[PDB]
Structure formats: structure tokens, C-alpha cells
Design a protein around this ligand. Structure first.
Ligand SMILES: [Mg+2]
Ligand SMILES: [Mg+2]
Ligand SMILES: [Mg+2]
Ligand SMILES: [Mg+2]
Ligand SMILES: [Mg+2]
Ligand SMILES: [Mg+2]
Ligand SMILES: [Mg+2]
Ligand SMILES: [Mg+2]
Ligand SMILES: [Mg+2]
Ligand SMILES: [Mg+2]
Ligand SMILES: [Mg+2]
Ligand SMILES: [Mg+2]
Ligand SMILES: [Mg+2]
Ligand SMILES: [Mg+2]
Ligand SMILES: [Mg+2]
Ligand SMILES: [Mg+2]
Ligand SMILES: [Mg+2]
Ligand SMILES: [Mg+2]
Ligand SMILES: [Mg+2]
Ligand SMILES: [Mg+2]
Ligand SMILES: [Mg+2]
Lengths: 214, 23, 177, 37, 146
RNA sequence: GAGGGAAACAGCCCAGAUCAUCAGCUAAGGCCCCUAAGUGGUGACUCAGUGGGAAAGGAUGUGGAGUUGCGUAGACAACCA
RNA sequence: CUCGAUGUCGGCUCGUCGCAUCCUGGGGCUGGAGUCGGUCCCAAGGGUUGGGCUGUUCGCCCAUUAAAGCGGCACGCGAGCU
RNA sequence: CGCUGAAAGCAUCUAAGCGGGAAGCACGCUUCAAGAUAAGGGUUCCCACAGGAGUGUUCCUGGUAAGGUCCCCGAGAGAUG
């Protein structure tokens, strides 16, 4: 239903600059390199409109015959990552079209989606902000404990969705309304004001801000 | 209470001819 | 149905097409559409009038009989005459002005003026910064438009300020006596 | 509006209607507006 | 020894019911009867002897009284505060297949075989269905006098 | 003290299991589907999902039957003095 | 029902539900001029502070806050703690 | 809170019909999701092998294609998977 611009990139790290008001801004550096249109989804064939973009360098010996055939139909050289962008104007893209970082200008607000850093199995105190018990005052081997996990006979069960220990991180995260600080289109570099999910070297999807701004 | 009133109301069913154990 | 059995005085130069259950009325002002409800028969009464009948003496039949009778009368007389229902504004600083024949702009003591639109079937006629009216070729939609205009700022009971019907009996009360 | 199980006519201008399944009293005096609930 | 059907002995037919202006309960009773082969002399509760029932115009199912808004269908995910409610009118407009399938399932024995036999009920809110290769034959809901 | 009915349900209803039967008629209770048998026939009423919980009390809901006041010497509502 | 054991007051921890709503949202009537209120109708989405005294719950008090809600869940919660 | 409006010559937000109206309801925002066995969809890839018993050709073994896994170097992942 919505029209979205988008590009694929790599998280390179964070730096800082001072804007025109001499305010220190933290910027994430994104190698928002060349993306090619590798497939176009239309309501006639796939039931929805989207653009499957390809981004990244790949060793030809690491691409398979199915992947080689997909890219050969697209007419492009193989890319490492294939990501679909849901946009109402997917009909304006052609197969093999080159999409660069200059899709966004110097003050665009963007949504950045990435897979966040992983923490392994975290306890209730770290992954859910639980307070344990006191360090002293009699507490008996339950300092970082979840406390109670339910009631009594009624109901004789733990309710679904109770917050417990478990593996946290490595999940899809979108940060909204991030201001594009700058775009260097010739070298495919994007300075975005703020912090984005994921470790350095992780794939990022930069899209138009769904809620425009705040 | 709901439970006791339903217990006393069950006696009005067709196959219990106006009576039931424990009213 | 005294009104229902009362036929429709058709004016001169108006084409009334009774396409079975459909009504077409054409004159020098506009065109109107309504599918005459099924359990009512309509005839042209030797092409110069309308006879509206009811199949049975049950209650719903007379309901729709009277409704259809004066509906046809309303619609034909609208294509030939047009209507008017009038409102007036009271209170210091309150004014109504025209942004065309299809628009109204109010300064009803708010922070900013209120802009009021209309359907194509309703046109406004503001004759005074403190007197105006709503007309059209319909008679329920005129009522709802006037009701909403009054609802924008209904009369306060302490000085009478606001929009009111041209002869409204605003029930007032004395406050700081 | 006064919402009571027992709504009656207070004014001589009060009128008791049934509207949308509720017994109400409508007067020109806003005090006498009643609803059954 | 009373007759018992053997696996695929009884042939299973395809039917199409036009649910235009048909009450939901009548359609559901008729569909449940057809799906389980209750109209056949070779009926067996343990062997699927029923037919395939296609229901078209499932968005035009008739409801009496104020059921289109006041008759509610409930679902629960199992976690607290996880109850959703909709009306049968909104179900018929939005997901007519789910509405008809719920109505039919409530009218069948609570079984494994009934869960298998409910897969034979194909429901479509529009007047057309994709099963012309199976040649469903028209079925008229009718009553036998006396 | 089993069987059938009452959703389940010692004490309620029907009915007292000698065994077998892939015969029939019934009781209480039922006959749209779950669930065996009527989406039974005829005539009324209800529109509250009442049926499928509840009080004092409130109410132009609706259908029916009486008693009584006014009334084409023209009654009640509306419109003119 | 349970005495061939159904651990109990308060707190901590973790919640979840109801609405008989404390705040925020919508409204009718006012002995509603305005700013403020009173009252009863909708409404459970989110929220609903930190301390002194006392084992307390409760309560009084201090400084705040939009507000410092009332209840159920074995007077929720000791094979979770004290 | 109304508009039109009868039953009930008036009146009436309602009976036919039409409309405004809340942090509530369902969406809008984010995330998971075809074991959704109803196991979905698009694109791309490999393709008619060998031998037995056969019994509508069935079916069972064997070597492979595309593709993977074991193994090793690691981390942006991780208790182990
Ligand atoms: Mg601590
Ligand atoms: Mg310790
Ligand atoms: Mg315990
Ligand atoms: Mg009591
Ligand atoms: Mg005995
Ligand atoms: Mg017995
Ligand atoms: Mg039983
Ligand atoms: Mg004996
Ligand atoms: Mg018999
Ligand atoms: Mg009998
Ligand atoms: Mg049967
Ligand atoms: Mg019948
Ligand atoms: Mg019958
Ligand atoms: Mg009930
Ligand atoms: Mg009662
Ligand atoms: Mg024991
Ligand atoms: Mg309430
Ligand atoms: Mg809540
Ligand atoms: Mg306790
Ligand atoms: Mg009126
Ligand atoms: Mg599921």
C-alpha cells in the first residue's frame, strides 16, 4: 500500500561529526553499495508488488547453478545478499537496474533494519530487566532469580508468555526516523545519524521512514 | 452464589421431575 | 392514507419517467434518482399526474404509500422551485461569510475560522454576516446540513451566543444573577 | 441525564418514549431527562 | 453379519450447494449430512462414505433476527487476555470459509474421521469455484413431506 | 443397585441385571446436526436469542377479552379570533 | 475434602484478571458566568512515586505527582527468597 | 447528540431509512509465522540411471546429477545442537 525507497548496505562502525549548530552527532557509517534489481514481483504473477534487490560481492565458485540461473535471468553478476523491498511502485523498476546510495538525500528520514547483536542465553535479569533479590539480608542462593512464576491451585499452571531466561539477540530490529546525515554516492558511503542494529559487517536495509518523522 | 444457584436450578430440567439430589 | 391517496400535482415542462420501479425527473434545474420501492405501484393517471397505490391494508403498505407519494411530490417540486431553511448567528465577534456559492466561513469565537463545504446537491446562501440559509433540491440532507452547522457552536444558555435556527426557541437561563 | 430503574414524568411536558429498547423521558426541561438503566 | 463397507468400496460424489439466501444452520446441517454419507444405505460411522460438498455464494448466507451483528464467534490463543471476538456477519464478509467451516464442524461428531471428512467441504464466498475438473453436481436442500 | 434419562453428576425420573440373541414392543425422556427417531400436520403467540437464572419497582412493547366517558345535534389532535 | 501434614502473618520477586475508574479519553444534568467543581453515564489502552514510625496489613505523617484506585487469583506467590 | 418520520392528522433520534461520536474495539507501527499436515507462492537448477524379484506397471537394492553433510580454519554465532 505504501511507496518505499530502499537500499542495501553494510554496517562499518560509528564515528562523530559536528553539524552546522556545532552539536556533536553520532553517525553510523553504512557501505550502501550498488544494489541491482534481481527480481520484480508483480500482482499478476506473485500476487504482490516488490523489488528483490541483490547486494554484495561473492566468489563465483561459491555460487550454485540455481543461483547462477537466477542471476543470469536477471542479467546481472551474482550478489551475496537478496532482499525484497515491499513498495507500491515496484512496476517502475527494471530487471538489472542499478540502485545506488544516492536514493537518499542529505536530510531524508530513514528506517534501518538489521539483525541485532547476540548475547547467547541470558537470564531474566539481563534479557527482561528483572530485579532479583537483595545481595544480603538472608537471601539464600536466589540473588538473580525470577521470583514467583505463577499463583497457586488457581491456575495450576504457568501462564503463556511468562518472561523467563533464554537466548536473546540475533533478531530483526528496525530503528525508525533516523536522519541521513550525508551520502557519498561515488564511493557508496552513507552517514546516518544514530545507532543501528547489528555488529560491524552486518547487512542493513535502509528504507524510507514509514512514519516520516516525529 | 452462582454455583449454588445453578445447582438449585438444575432441578428444573425436563428429566428431573422438579427434584434433584441436594436440592 | 389521506396524503397517499392524494395524487401529485405535476408542474409544466417537467419530464417524469416512471421506468417501472425507477423514477427519473428532468426539468430546468437538475436530475434526481430513486428506485421506487417494490410493494408500491405507480401510474401516470392519463400521463398528467401520479397515482400511487398500496397492495394491501397492512401498516407497512401505508407507511411506504405516504412516503412515496410525498417523495415524488418533493422531488418534482424540487426540480421546479428549490427550497430554503434559515439559520442566524448571535454573539459578539461572530460572523459568517461566503467562499463561493458552495462554501461557508465562520468566525464563531474559535482560535481560527471554520470552513464548511457542501455536496453538489446543497448550496449555501449567506445574506448577512449574522443571517444565512441552506438550500438544495432535497429535504432531509438540508436538515442534516443545517443541524451540523448549528452543532458547530450551539447556543450557550447564558447569553444566547452561537448558531441557531431562524426562529429557534433557545431555552435560556440567568447565570450570575 | 438521570439513569434509574424508575423513570417517570416530572413535568407536565415530560413525555415517556421507548427508544432503541430503553424507556426514556424527554422534557423541554433538561433536568427531567431520564433513562432506564 | 450386517454389511460393512470396505475402504474404497463406496464411491464418493462431488456436490455444489448455492448458499445464496440459505440460512447458515440449514446449509450446515445439509453439508454435515452429505460429508458423512448419512443419505446413503451403505453408511458406516467408521468408514468415510460421504461426498465432497462445494458451497458457493458463502458471502450471501442468510441470517435471521439481529444475528449478523449480535451472534458472536470467539477464539482464544491460550495466553491470558488472548480472546478475540467477531460477529458472524463480519466473518461471512471477511472469511466466509471459516464461518461455514465452524458451523459445519460444530455439527459433526468430535472425531479423527470427522476432521478428515471436513477437508471435503470446499467453501467459496463468490459464485464461482475452481473444481470444474471434479464436476460437482447441483444439490437442492429439500424436505420430505410427513 | 447395574440398565435408560437428567451434558457430566451416590440419594431426582423410569426401571430392579439368571445367561445367550446382529428379533419385536415400550417407560422416563426425546425426534434440525452432534445423537436413534418429525428440518411432522393444523391453529395461535414471542422478536426478547425471551426460550437458554432473580426482587421491590418502572414502562404508549405486543396480541386478546370486558366495564365505562365523549362523538356526523360532530368527538380528540392541528391550524385561524 | 484434607490430621499415614492442604505450611500460616507481613514484606521482596514475578505477574495475570475484574471494574465497583484514582489519572488520562468521551458525554448528560447542574443551585455549569469564567477559572475551578459536584453528580452519574460510557470507558480497563497505558499509567498509578520516594521516604519517617511500627513485624506488621492497616493507619498517621513528610516531600512529591496527571494520579498516588479498589478488589480476585489457597486473605496469588516459602520444592521462589525472608 | 441528531436528520427525515409514521404507527398515534400533533409529537417522537426509530418503527422504514440516514448521520456525527472515546486513550476503548479492529487496523495503521514493530516482530514471529505454511507442522496454516489446508504443509502455500515466484524464480532458478538437475534430470528419463543400473540390477533383481515382479504382477496395471508395483516393490526392493545400487551408483550418481543438481544440491548438501561429515572434516578442518574461525566469529559478527554459541551451554551443546
Ligand atoms: Mg540489586
Ligand atoms: Mg549469596
Ligand atoms: Mg508453593
Ligand atoms: Mg446473596
Ligand atoms: Mg438398592
Ligand atoms: Mg443407577
Ligand atoms: Mg451419559
Ligand atoms: Mg431379577
Ligand atoms: Mg416402535
Ligand atoms: Mg412417553
Ligand atoms: Mg439421524
Ligand atoms: Mg418447516
Ligand atoms: Mg415444526
Ligand atoms: Mg437467557
Ligand atoms: Mg425478571
Ligand atoms: Mg499422603
Ligand atoms: Mg463502568
Ligand atoms: Mg489492561
Ligand atoms: Mg496467601
Ligand atoms: Mg421531532
Ligand atoms: Mg496453530
Amino acid at each position: 500500500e505504501r511507496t518505499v525507497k530502499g537500499v542495501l548496505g553494510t554496517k562499518l562502525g560509528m564515528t562523530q561529526l559536528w553539524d552546522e549548530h556545532n552539536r556533536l552527532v553520532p553517525v553510523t557509517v553504512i557501505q550502501a553499495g550498488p544494489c541491482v534489481v534481481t527480481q520484480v514481483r508483480t500482482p499478476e504473477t506473485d500476487g504482490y508488488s516488490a523489488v528483490q534487490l541483490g547486494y554484495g560481492a561473492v566468489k563465483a565458485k561459491n555460487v550454485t547453478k540455481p543461483e547462477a540461473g537466477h542471476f543470469e535471468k536477471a542479467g546481472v553478476t551474482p550478489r551475496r545478499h537478496l532482499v525484497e523491498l515491499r513498495t507500491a511502485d515496484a512496476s517502475e523498476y527494471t530487471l538489472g537496474q542499478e540502485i545506488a546510495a544516492d536514493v537518499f538525500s542529505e536530510s531524508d528520514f530513514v528506517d534501518v533494519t538489521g539483525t541485532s547483536k547476540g548475547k547467547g542465553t541470558a537470564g531474566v535479569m539481563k534479557r527482561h530487566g528483572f530485579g532479583g533479590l537483595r545481595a544480603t539480608h538472608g537471601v539464600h542462593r536466589k540473588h538473580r532469580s525470577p521470583g514467583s512464576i505463577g499463583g497457586c491451585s488457581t491456575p495450576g499452571k504457568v501462564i503463556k508468555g511468562l518472561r523467563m531466561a533464554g537466548r536473546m539477540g540475533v533478531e530483526r530490529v528496525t530503528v525508525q526516523n533516523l536522519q541521513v546525515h550525508s551520502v557519498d554516492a561515488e564511493r557508496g558511503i552513507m552517514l546516518v545519524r544514530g545507532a543501528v542494529p547489528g555488529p560491524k559487517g552486518s547487512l542493513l536495509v535502509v528504507r524510507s521512514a514509514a512514519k516520516k518523522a516525529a | 452464589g452462582k454455583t449454588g444457584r445453578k445447582r438449585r436450578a438444575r432441578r428444573k430440567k425436563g428429566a428431573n421431575h422438579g427434584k434433584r439430589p441436594n436440592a | 392514507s389521506r396524503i397517499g391517496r392524494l395524487p401529485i400535482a405535476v408542474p409544466s415542462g417537467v419530464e417524469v419517467k416512471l421506468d417501472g420501479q425507477y423514477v427519473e425527473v428532468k426539468g430546468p434545474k437538475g436530475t434526481l434518482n430513486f428506485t421506487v420501492r417494490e410493494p408500491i405501484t405507480v401510474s401516470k393517471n392519463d400521463e398528467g399526474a401520479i397515482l400511487v397505490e398500496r397492495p394491501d391494508d397492512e401498516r407497512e403498505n401505508r407507511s411506504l404509500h405516504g412516503l412515496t407519494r410525498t417523495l415524488i411530490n418533493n422531488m418534482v417540486i424540487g426540480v421546479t422551485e428549490g427550497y430554503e431553511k434559515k439559520l442566524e448567528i448571535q454573539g459578539v465577534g461572530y460572523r459568517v461569510l461566503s467562499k463561493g456559492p458552495k462554501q461557508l466561513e465562520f468566525n464563531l469565537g474559535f482560535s481560527h475560522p471554520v470552513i464548511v463545504d457542501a455536496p453538489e446537491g446543497i448550496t449555501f446562501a449567506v445574506e448577512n454576516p449574522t443571517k444565512f440559509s441552506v438550500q438544495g433540491i432535497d429535504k432531509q440532507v438540508v436538515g442534516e446540513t443545517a443541524a451540523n452547522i448549528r452543532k458547530i457552536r450551539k447556543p450557550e444558555p447564558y447569553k444566547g451566543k452561537g448558531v441557531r435556527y431562524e426562529g429557534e426557541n433557545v431555552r435560556r437561563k440567568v447565570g450570575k444573577a | 441525564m438521570k439513569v434509574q430503574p424508575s423513570v417517570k414524568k416530572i413535568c407536565d411536558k415530560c413525555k415517556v418514549i421507548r427508544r432503541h429498547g430503553r424507556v426514556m423521558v424527554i422534557c423541554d426541561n433538561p433536568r427531567h431527562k431520564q433513562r432506564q438503566g | 453379519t450386517t454389511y460393512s463397507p470396505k475402504a474404497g468400496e463406496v464411491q464418493r460424489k462431488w456436490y455444489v450447494i448455492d448458499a445464496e439466501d440459505i440460512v447458515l444452520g440449514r446449509l450446515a446441517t445439509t453439508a454435515a449430512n452429505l460429508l458423512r454419507g448419512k443419505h446413503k444405505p451403505q453408511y458406516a460411522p467408521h468408514i468415510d462414505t460421504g461426498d465432497f460438498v462445494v458451497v458457493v455464494n458463502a458471502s450471501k448466507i442468510a441470517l435471521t433476527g439481529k444475528k449478523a451483528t449480535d451472534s458472536l464467534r470467539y477464539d482464544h490463543s491460550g495466553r491470558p487476555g488472548g480472546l478475540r471476538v467477531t460477529s458472524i456477519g463480519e466473518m461471512l464478509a471477511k472469511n466466509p470459509r471459516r464461518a461455514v467451516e465452524r458451523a459445519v464442524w460444530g455439527m459433526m461428531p468430535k472425531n479423527k474421521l470427522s476432521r478428515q471428512q471436513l477437508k471435503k467441504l470446499k467453501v467459496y464466498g463468490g459464485p464461482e469455484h475452481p473444481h470444474a475438473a471434479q464436476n460437482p453436481q447441483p444439490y437442492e436442500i429439500t424436505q420430505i413431506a410427513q
